[PDB]
Design a binder for this molecule. Structure first.
Ligand SMILES: N[C@@H](Cc1c[nH]c[nH+]1)C(=O)O
Ligand SMILES: N[C@@H](Cc1c[nH]c[nH+]1)C(=O)O
Ligand SMILES: OCc1ccc(Cl)cc1
Ligand SMILES: OCc1ccc(Cl)cc1
Lengths: 411, 411
């Protein structure tokens, strides 16, 4: 007997599990459509060079990479943002900006699960925080669409610019800022030692620690000034979300930095308000990424990733993932095999009218056919019997007793 | 500058190209739903052992395989049928039969393109040709849904049982039947040699050649008898398709065997009637596969694959793939930045009502905002200006001039 289990860390989706995934993905797609985002995709296999960012990121540390027969360094994508950036860079001047692009890629890792789907939403060519506002509202919109409330979840929001200033004021060369963010993200203090290793004195580490523990934007304003970009941008951000009607979903948290090297501005992450789960989604502004890829002009970008695993756990806890049973509109039942041709003509007509319909394919008796119809969630059984067929009719039975119906009146 | 081209043999789908793929996939999904098939999925990464069939199949010869860090032989799936079989086998007794399962996996190869998407449709637990009938009708239904006619395309149909009988009558051990099919699929001089290599006398090769050139079912009946399984099954098959109303789409062709080891019964393939393209789709009955995987009871199966590349070429030729431009229902335009909060409230209301809507995110003048709206295919522009806002109104302009509308009446 062959191995029936999937490869280590990967999931099968038989139809029951696929209905759940589809429920989630319908929301991702519908939210993207509601927000005017365009779908794109790119190969799951990318060149390894795309992810060599040299900032000690967990995401690049745990890459599912391998070497092709021809000796080329490739990887199954750990994330989608680099692929997006590749595509944008390849279009160059021909791309109309602003652009709002989304996708739902499977992404990979090697170390637990080795595989997940991640809804990506990114806005390209918008300098102002209106982008982050829209992105955050999109994430909330998807969660609300799944039945969650602002009591259940929220989005923590911060700007990396506050920390940037603190690091710059201490004389720390700007090429250490990304590593500093990767490290400070690990506050989940073994962190104090890593910063020293990166090459920062205790007074600099102290100031970092203090700013991550500031509990309001006003306290940020006190320290760096109300004119500081981070303050103005965060204030605009909250004003706009408030205006859009999702004020209860969002809040300021000075300890949110994210683990990715490339965030330059606002960053955010979704969380359950019971403190039971890891982040539901995560994102930020990344204005220099395209420049590091060789773009001749800077290109503003912001976006988020929203995984398919934590959300499902949360929804299970909140009893928002009831079993969705399979459904089909009609099941056409030949009285016997001599009625199969007529039944096929009936089946054709039902499908032509936009109905989902089965025909009983195997040889079986009517009662068993009826049971089968019930099992597949048929709304209606259509019995094609010789007596009614002579009258230009079939027998119809609703499952959600027994009437004869003219062939033209079935739809 | 990073490499902007995708990895060798793989495709990018920026939004323009994604709209085309989506148009196709909508049809696959909608056809599956119309025919009552259930969606499933499985990991793109499978164990190599799953595909070691030892029949010299092109599909197993060109596997994209590699070795994990831990030393496990894995592959990116060349096809989906083995994964399906794995899943079915893992469910075992708990799976209700009949089952009709579909998916649209990306499948891979190494050698030209290294990657394609393939609509898979399979029926499990049906012994009778009604399964093949439904599968073939499904393929036709998808093609007709895309705008093709029976003048444009058809499905060639055969049974491997005819050739089975010929091989058995020559004393050829049954373990050579699959290799024989793989070889005969490669068609005159060149194929004749491979059969000899496989270990078959010229008289046996002659008889094979003759049966592949028989031009009707009647000629098959003359050779192997009218009561031969293949003849009765093919006759039932055509009677049923005729009854379903797709008789013009299907025909008998004795040279169709397919290249896969596992087909035991009826086989078929879609083709353009101009003879310009490779096969549009391909499939058949494979009643022993689950038995070879270790199933304790035989499990009848039939299905097909329908790739995403040949169909698109054909549709391009027939001018059935017009550019589908992006569309959005509304574009909300703040008169200026002081109107952004009100505009956001308007945007919220539009989206709450199920409309797709943008808001102009960066700072720009109204006419440029209008142009942008036209560029993204907005049906309607909604100008949020201070004069109208005092009256509880906005200005609306249809893009396919200028009226004031109450906020509650926008939807
Ligand atoms: N790539 C990020 C999410 C993201 C999308 N766009 C910007 N950021 C992550 O995996 O966490
Ligand atoms: N796996 C086959 C198609 C198929 C699906 N189910 C049965 N046959 C192919 O790739 O050609
Ligand atoms: O490294 C990001 C990542 C996280 C989770 C999975 Cl399963 C795959 C990738
Ligand atoms: O032979 C299977 C296969 C065929 C075509 C592509 Cl592109 C990928 C896989």
């Amino acid at each position: 007997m062959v191995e029936t289990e999937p490869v280590q860390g990967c999931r099968d989706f038989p139809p029951e599990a696929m209905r759940c995934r589809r429920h989630l993905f319908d929301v991702f797609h519908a939210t993207a459509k509601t927000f005017g985002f365009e779908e794109y995709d790119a190969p799951v296999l990318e060149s390894e060079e795309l992810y060599i960012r040299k900032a000690g990121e967990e995401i690049t540390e745990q890459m599912f990479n391998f070497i092709t027969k021809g000796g080329h360094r490739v990887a199954l994508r750990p994330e989608m943002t680099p692929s997006l950036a590749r595509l944008l860079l390849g279009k160059g001047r021909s791309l109309l900006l602003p652009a709002k692009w989304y996708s739902i890629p499977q992404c990979w890792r090697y170390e637990r699960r080795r595989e997940h789907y991640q809804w990506n939403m990114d806005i390209v060519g918008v300098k102002s925080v209106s982008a982050e506002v829209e992105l955050v509202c999109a994430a909330c919109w998807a969660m609300r669409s799944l039945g969650l409330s602002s009591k259940d979840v929220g989005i923590k929001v911060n700007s990396r610019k506050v920390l940037q200033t603190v690091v710059e004021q201490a004389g720390v060369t700007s090429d250490k800022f990304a590593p500093v963010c990767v490290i400070v993200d690990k506050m989940e203090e073994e962190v104090e030692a890593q910063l020293a290793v990166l090459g920062l004195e205790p007074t600099v580490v102290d100031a970092i620690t203090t700013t991550l523990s500031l509990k309001s934007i006003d306290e940020i304003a006190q320290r760096v000034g109300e004119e500081h970009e981070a303050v103005k941008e965060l204030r605009q951000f909250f004003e706009q979300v408030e205006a859009y009607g999702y004020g209860d979903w969002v809040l300021f948290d000075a300890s949110v930095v994210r683990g990715l090297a490339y965030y330059t501005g606002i960053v955010f992450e979704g969380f359950d308000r019971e403190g039971k789960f890891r982040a539901l989604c995560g994102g930020g502004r990344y204005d220099n990424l395209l420049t590091t890829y060789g773009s001749p002009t800077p290109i503003p970008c912001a976006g988020f990733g929203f995984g398919d695993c934590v959300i499902v756990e949360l929804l299970q806890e909140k009893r928002l993932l009831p079993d969705i049973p399979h459904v089909v509109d009609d099941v056409v039942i030949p009285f016997d095999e001599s009625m199969r041709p007529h039944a096929l003509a009936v089946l054709r007509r039902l499908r032509d009218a936009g109905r989902s319909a089965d025909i009983i394919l195997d040889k079986k008796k009517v009662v068993q056919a009826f049971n089968y119809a019930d099992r597949v969630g048929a709304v209606r059984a259509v019995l094609v019997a010789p007596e009614e067929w002579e009258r230009g009719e079939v027998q119809v039975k609703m499952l959600r007793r027994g009437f004869a119906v003219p062939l033209d009146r079935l739809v």
